[PDB]
Write an enzyme that holds these catalytic residues in place. Structure first.
Site, PDB file in Angstrom:
ATOM      1  N   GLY A 122      27.081  15.931  36.762  1.00 51.06           N
ATOM      2  CA  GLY A 122      25.636  15.876  36.638  1.00 51.06           C
ATOM      3  C   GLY A 122      25.121  16.530  35.373  1.00 51.06           C
ATOM      4  CB  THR A 123      25.885  19.769  33.800  1.00 55.20           C
ATOM      5  OG1 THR A 123      27.293  19.820  33.540  1.00 55.20           O
ATOM      6  CG2 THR A 123      25.606  20.366  35.172  1.00 55.20           C
ATOM      7  CB  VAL A 124      25.273  17.673  29.064  1.00 55.38           C
ATOM      8  CG1 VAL A 124      24.153  16.807  29.621  1.00 55.38           C
ATOM      9  CG2 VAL A 124      24.746  19.044  28.663  1.00 55.38           C
ATOM     10  CE  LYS A 141      22.689  12.630  28.615  1.00 52.46           C
ATOM     11  NZ  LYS A 141      21.258  12.701  28.204  1.00 52.46           N
ATOM     12  CG  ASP A 172       8.111  13.067  23.295  1.00 49.01           C
ATOM     13  OD1 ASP A 172       7.136  13.535  22.669  1.00 49.01           O
ATOM     14  OD2 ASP A 172       8.740  13.716  24.157  1.00 49.01           O
TER      15      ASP A 172
END
Lengths: 244, 54, 258
Positions: free
Chosen positions: C1-3, C16, C115
């Protein structure tokens, strides 16, 4: 600066097209059970599915691009060849259609030979094997790009578009669709469409001679290689009409 | 109704499809973790060329 | 789930693994289109955008793992660690070149970043700008998205003009409270646009802002040459249909150097 800016876009369309390309020699090397006759059989079925479901004109040729590419990497059984074609339509309809084909409705079109649990499990296998390279350049992309440069009226642009889109569908069922890149298939369809169907005398604002020299210059294939692609198309139209 | 609903090449040995679809799915996993030393399904290991830190 | 992070040959990569809602129709529509759009850029690769190395899917819910091209240093760090007097004018020109090259690359492929900020702009140790976080504060927000109107693609070029001026002040150009307040500080520099340049079906009317005059561009970014002030105003143009494009910016006299 529309002259260069349109070649700016067209240069990018030809470079990205060279990535999502299958190998023409997968029948002899990769596939054992699958024969070139069996591809036309499953392609004709996939075409009818998109005809009845009133799919976007891009869905069927895009699904065949997935089929040729998957058959260029992995062997598929004779029984599972239809399962592969249904999965290709399942992904192609997601890419182009607003409301895609339901996996249940696709299994009904297989006469319930496959089940939705098998189509979804094949979806992961197909997309992983294609390296998630699903945004392939389509013949419709080049057709719409060529029409923007043809100074024909919108009424004639739409009738040329319909005939060219029809010629692309007939190509996808023949083995010519494997070796020919989408730039050739699109351009050969346009020049075969601007001749009409021999129904009337061709009256067009941009001359057919000027259109052939223009298309053969930008997509890079000499007029002898462009008319050869057109004659194959009109041969497919002859073979399509004869089988009726 | 619809002339396009039909089986194209007879029957399908059902389980062997579920048997094969997992045989080549794990093959894609093996090709994945043999490129970057990192088991995708378990998201953990090292040993190869990776560094890996949360 | 994390990187995670690895780095091995431009030598840094990440990984990821995201959970997608598996349901009746298998993979979601937006899931297959977003990844396919990212994979289409790998045909040209391009140096000013991050490359998607590999994507693999493993099966409730499905788990998809993406291996990205990561850069450890971003733009804010690059500007914070800048030479204490600031950045050389020729160094800034080269950064704006790679900046607009990667932006024109995304725009040419039907991609709007939406963004853009120094946190979303990575710079390698060798000085290579690489854009990231796309197709996946209100300071750099364009006027049409503050007013909540027609977004389109010129919203990125406004963000470039803001970062353009920030490379000479090292402090953000427009820093306000809310959307209504951000437009005020913007209009305090470019003046109050007329009603014809104001968009229809908009959240805040033109009467929401007092009449203001366009201050000179050199009044706030005086460390910049005369031609750069001309190029900045074309980026910071209110009407998005008159705003300069990324390709035109490459052709302006300020960046046609070397």
């Amino acid at each position: 600066d529309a002259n260069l800016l349109n070649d700016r876009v067209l240069r990018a369309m030809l470079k990205a097209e060279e990535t999502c390309a299958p190998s023409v020699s997968y029948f002899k090397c990769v596939q054992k059970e699958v024969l070139p006759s069996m591809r036309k059989i499953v392609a004709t079925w996939m075409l009818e599915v998109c005809e009845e479901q009133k799919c976007e004109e891009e869905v069927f040729p895009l699904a065949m691009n997935y089929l040729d590419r998957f058959l260029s990497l992995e062997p598929v059984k004779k029984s599972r060849l239809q399962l592969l074609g249904a999965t290709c339509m399942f992904v192609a309809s997601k890419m182009k259609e607003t409301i895609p084909l339901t996996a249940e409705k696709l299994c009904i079109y297989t006469d319930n030979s496959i089940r939705p649990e098998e189509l979804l499990q094949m979806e992961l296998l197909l997309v992983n094997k294609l390296k998630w390279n699903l945004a392939a350049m389509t013949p419709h992309d080049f057709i719409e790009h060529f029409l923007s440069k043809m100074p024909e009226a919108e009424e004639n642009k739409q009738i040329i578009r319909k005939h060219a889109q029809t010629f692309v569908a007939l190509c996808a069922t023949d083995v010519k669709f494997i070796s020919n890149p989408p730039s050739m298939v699109a351009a050969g369809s346009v020049v075969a469409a601007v001749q009409g169907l021999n129904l009337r005398s061709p009256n067009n604002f941009l001359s057919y001679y000027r259109l052939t020299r223009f298309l053969s210059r930008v997509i890079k294939c000499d007029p002898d290689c462009l008319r050869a692609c057109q004659e194959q198309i009109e041969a497919l139209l002859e073979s399509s009409l004869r089988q009726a | 109704g619809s002339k396009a609903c039909r089986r194209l090449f007879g029957p399908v040995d059902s389980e062997q499809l579920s048997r094969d679809c997992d045989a080549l799915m794990a093959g894609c996993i093996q090709e994945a973790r043999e490129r970057w030393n990192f088991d995708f399904v378990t998201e953990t290991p090292l040993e190869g060329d990776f560094a890996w830190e949360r | 789930g994390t990187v995670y992070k690895a780095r091995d040959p431009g030598h840094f990569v990440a990984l990821k693994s995201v959970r997608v809602p598996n349901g009746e129709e298998g993979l979601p529509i937006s899931t297959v289109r977003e990844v396919a759009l990212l994979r289409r850029l790998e045909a040209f690769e391009h140096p000013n955008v991050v490359r998607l190395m590999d994507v693999c899917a493993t099966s409730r819910e499905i788990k998809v793992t993406l291996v990205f091209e990561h850069v450890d240093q971003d733009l804010r760090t690059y500007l914070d660690k800048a030479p204490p007097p600031g950045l050389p004018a020729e160094t800034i020109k080269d950064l704006m070149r790679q900046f607009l090259r990667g932006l024109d690359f995304l725009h040419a492929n039907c991609i709007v970043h939406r963004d853009l900020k120094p946190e979303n702009i990575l710079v390698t140790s060798g000085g290579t700008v690489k854009l990231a976080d796309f197709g996946l504060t209100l300071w750099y927000r364009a006027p049409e998205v503050l007013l909540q109107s027609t977004y389109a693609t010129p919203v990125d070029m406004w963000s470039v003009g803001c970062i353009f001026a920030e490379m000479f002040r090292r402090k953000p150009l427009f820093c306000g409270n809310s959307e209504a307040d951000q437009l005020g500080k913007i209009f305090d520099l470019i003046g109050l646009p007329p009603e014809d340049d104001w968009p229809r079906d908009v959240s805040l009317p033109r009467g929401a802002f007092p009449p203001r005059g366009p201050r000179p561009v050199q009044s706030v970014v005086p460390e910049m040459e005369e031609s750069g002030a001309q190029l900045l105003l074309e980026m910071l143009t209110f009407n998005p249909h008159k705003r300069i494009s990324a390709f035109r910016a490459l052709q302006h006299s300020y960046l046609h150097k070397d």
